Symmetry: D2
Subunit: 237 residues, 4 copies
């Protein structure tokens, strides 16, 4: 009854979830255990920047995760998505810190999709950039431990008044308006997500990762979602 | 209680409420009597595209309508527009009748709101444009006799089956997502719309009009806003 | 010497050069024989909009044509496309005839090229879209029988006065400004076009075709590229 | 024979040019001595960010010049511009350091204009953002002392290999493709420029300012332009 499709950014080799023994990534499509994974060297006190994309005539949800002067990590998945999802969708992103804390700060969120096909020569589109995270979005919908208004920062996890992030948050920020990838006439049908994230952790082998999901209109957290359950999979590794 | 700032495509002069000598688009700030105006040449069975532009800086509320081959019709009005509207503001369109028929028949809808200044310099945007209006809109919000679902079209007013419009309708649609023109850290909030309309009526006086509007978020059809009123105003002038 | 990578709206099967059984759009990488193809249903006196999308990441050259009410025609092709083109690359369109008439008649032109990765994360873009083609274009570049100046229209081919097209024309237009898909600091160069066409010909075999192309910057009409050739290719297959 | 219209950013009260005794700004329209000026507190080793804008139905070229957490400086000028310019235009920006050096580094240049009016429902547009100034633009046209490729920086003035900026440069960077603000049908006709500049100067009372011009297709430097002549006015204070 609860569907979703994000791109995993598992920083803790939660190899139990048979996952890669390490900082991988990947395209889970409803089951927490990914379709295609790939290696990714994290970085502390360092800003990250994920990228997604898809095309209707392409069939390939994918991404690549850089760190300036450094390297990054792509990925690609031949998929229809018109399979995975229903005609209307709500897009958000959410992190989870596990047994260990960290800071899943969202720094610069952007989302833009666009439709057309039909030849009717029309194309349509939703898009909004975010850069000045105030305190209350009215337009953003937070869920859990996602507090918002810090400094133009977006925090989807708990963390103190001084500098003390906990290790059990699980939040959920997503765009108030719902998206789409329906329409008859439909031919090609992009969207492109992308965000400057930046995790840190005092400790040496941090848990656990971040995500970016499309999904239900009214998707909600998982009684699961924890750690590896990414805050989006009921659980059932 | 409910505020609004928005431009009206009057198509029936109503010299009883200050609706001068003939068609006039109007810049209303709560009253059906436009602070500033200019005449209008309602073109039946024709394609015409309204406008509005704003400047944070600048600050000049200025719309424009325009039919093909023929000349357009300008008219603006200088205001502060952050002394009337609230912080976060949701929007759509609407329009009424009350004594004949008409097709407050909409063709396609465009919007964009740019918020900058910050000193982070980067622009926070939301923006969309419909070019296909199918059955139920979802991001949409209808609001009465307005209906969504007849031909990649959007009709705010009432109209029979085979094409026989009634004339005791009102019809309002908004945006599912609250919008946002203020940001503390601001110093240049801009927003721009534009939609094509196409009102028929087989009469020769089809009234009364329509209008491009904004407002609050718990803005609903004013129980008697009709003919004039414009499905906005609470009653009176 | 002159390179090019670009999609062709063949409208005359030429089984002599590998122009199979009927109309086929084609993905050419230097030769008039498309590496990948799919059939086509040339629709005279009709409105149809070609496409092309690319992915830095991804990298899949994939266009699409489409007439209304009716179904579209897909077909893509995976390439690296930064092993063939040069750094800085200028573009436009073109198309030919050589044995009957036709209206390689263009309606409107769209483009956009996004270059990101950087680690500055911010996007370097150029993008434009014509919807009005008046007399002389200026940012434009015509290139033969192609003419600029008959009705917010753009015709790459020859055609008489009152409407009597000849059939020994070629007609190429480009962009006045060199473009740019490579950036050292890159890791996701994207670009997207789309234009509406409208070829007539009162015959029933109007050939030969047209095609969406790129290339070098000192790219000019290949002295004999005609019928097929496509005003690109130097001669031969 | 040489026309141009920029927005002056005179950091040296070159009060001779009867100018404000200080760091003003302003809208010169062919004669170096401004139309409307206004005060502006510079800042060293500090990044600046100018903003322009105009509207066809508005009549108001203007700008505002901020410095985060700080203040800025707007300006506005009721003007047609369809007067000041010809139908086709080339847009650039250029600085000049006078008797004293400084660093007129251009950090983030952006330009976007758009047309439509006509009701033909079409709108057209040019736009490109710049953020990774390599060494040669092919697309940028430099003129004088504008060197380009430093670090993702744009320098329109001389300055050493170690850290030694001279005080006599005069450069000129502008977009290869030409812009426009012609078209019949014309109704409203924006553009919006905007850039993160950042001057510095070891010395206490630096010369002299920066600019941003529209102008000729092939405008060139002034045998003047120096210091206050901004690199765009033949001279004739």
């Amino acid at each position: 009854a609860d569907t979703i499709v994000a791109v995993e950014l598992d920083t803790y080799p939660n190899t139990d979830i048979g996952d890669p023994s390490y900082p991988h990534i990947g395209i889970d499509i409803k089951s927490v255990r990914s379709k295609k994974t790939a290696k990714w060297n994290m970085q502390d006190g360092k800003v990250g920047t994920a990228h997604i994309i898809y095309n209707s005539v392409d069939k390939r949800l994918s991404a690549v995760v850089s760190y300036p002067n450094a390297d990054a990590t792509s990925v690609s998945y031949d998929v229809d998505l018109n399979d995975v999802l229903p005609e209307w969708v709500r897009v958000g992103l959410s992190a989870s810190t596990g047994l260990y804390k960290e800071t899943n700060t969202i720094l610069s969120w952007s989302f833009t999709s666009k439709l057309k096909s039909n030849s009717t020569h029309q194309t349509d589109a939703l898009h909004f950039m975010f850069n000045q995270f105030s305190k209350d979005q009215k337009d953003l919908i937070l869920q859990g431990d996602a507090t918002t208004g810090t400094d133009g920062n977006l925090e989807l996890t708990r963390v103190s008044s001084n500098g003390s992030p906990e290790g059990s948050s699980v939040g959920r920020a997503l765009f108030y308006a719902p998206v789409h990838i329906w329409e008859s006439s439909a031919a090609t049908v992009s969207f492109e997500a992308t965000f400057a994230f930046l995790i840190k952790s005092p400790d040496s082998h941090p848990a656990d990762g971040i995500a970016f999901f499309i999904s239900n209109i009214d998707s909600s957290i998982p009684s699961g979602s924890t750690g590896r359950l990414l805050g989006l999979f009921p659980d059932a590794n």
